[PDB]
Write a protein that binds this ligand. Structure first.
Ligand code: ANP
Ligand code: 6II
Length: 270
């Protein structure tokens, strides 16, 4: 029915407010005129609320009767290349990121990180990518909100193809119609991405696919979160499949989407 960090209730029905970020505002404005228009939440412009700027977005949960939601972070890389430059010239040591690391694998931090009780953001993000499915499959499950009100973010070590399949298997709860609709939507999204003027021109980092379904077998998928999506310089383009090597700005977005369609197609035959 309604999603209600960055989010606030909107005046108009079926809308949601999200804290304005300049990269995200640029991106949503472009996407409304792109092949991808139908694959992203409708963007209605910016509004002021308590002296601060908000994106007026379509509430993706509005069409659904008690929605189940899964957030899938897309790409082999989850940080901008500029973070790698900043961490070499002027590292911001992060003590929070060190404690999250210790918790999952106490042997993961180096002798110096242990001494620092702190890690760089890129180091933490590369580690996160490697213990989840991000590095190998080019996406990872971030979270589920079920129809019973229960939520989980317990997916940091969800890595193998079969582990990912079991999360989707539990998420769709044997609803053949929801899974068929999800696969049809993902096939149509892949086709739209492969012709999109926006997509060939932009490095898409930190974006998610939001899967939404309900007990009436309504099912939708949208791309969300363009806070780290940046244009390539002087008419350079990405294939979004080839491996990332510092300088090439490749995100593996379509490697991810390919693997995700493969896993859902496998689940459909089980
Ligand atoms: N347009 C939308 N309508 C309804 N729910 C949304 C919408 N956009 C995002 N959400 C929900 O809010 C969550 C956060 O979205 P996101 O755009 O990633 O926010 P963020 O705080 O900017 N980034 P992140 O750090 O990745 O969570 C999603 O996982 C959804 O559950
Ligand atoms: O999911 P966990 O393991 O908690 O890690 C978190 O992953 C976010 C991306 O999902 C990052 O956000 P980002 O989109 O890069 O701004 C956070 O970074 P930050 O603390 O804000 O510098 C980072 O801690």
């Amino acid at each position: 029915g309604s999603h209600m960090g960055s989010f606030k209730a909107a005046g108009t029905s079926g809308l949601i407010l999200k804290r304005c970020s300049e990269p995200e505002r640029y991106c949503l404005a472009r996407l409304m005129a792109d092949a991808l228009r139908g694959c992203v939440p409708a963007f209605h412009g910016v509004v002021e609320r308590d002296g601060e700027s908000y994106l007026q977005l379509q509430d993706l949960l509005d069409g659904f009767d008690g929605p189940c939601v899964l957030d899938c972070k897309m790409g082999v890389r989850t940080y901008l290349e500029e973070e790698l430059t900043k961490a070499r010239e002027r590292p911001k040591l992060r003590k929070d990121m060190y404690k999250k690391m210790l918790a999952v694998d106490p042997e993961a931090p180096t002798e110096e990180e242990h001494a620092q009780r702190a890690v760089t953001k890129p180091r933490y993000m590369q580690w996160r990518e490697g213990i989840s499915s991000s590095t190998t499959l080019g996406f990872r499950i971030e979270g589920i909100k079920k129809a019973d009100g229960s939520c989980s973010t317990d997916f940091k070590t969800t890595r193998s193809r079969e582990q990912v399949l079991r999360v989707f298997e539990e998420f769709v709860q044997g609803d053949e119609e929801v899974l068929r609709r999800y696969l049809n939507r993902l096939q149509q999204i892949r086709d739209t991405l492969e012709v999109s003027e926006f997509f060939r021109r932009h490095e898409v980092i930190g974006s998610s696919l939001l899967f939404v379904h309900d007990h009436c077998h309504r099912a939708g998928v949208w791309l969300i979160d363009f806070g780290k999506t940046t244009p390539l310089p002087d008419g350079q383009i990405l294939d979004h499949r080839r491996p990332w090597e510092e300088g090439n700005r490749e995100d593996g977005y379509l490697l991810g989407l390919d693997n995700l369609i493969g896993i859902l197609a496998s689940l459909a035959e089980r």
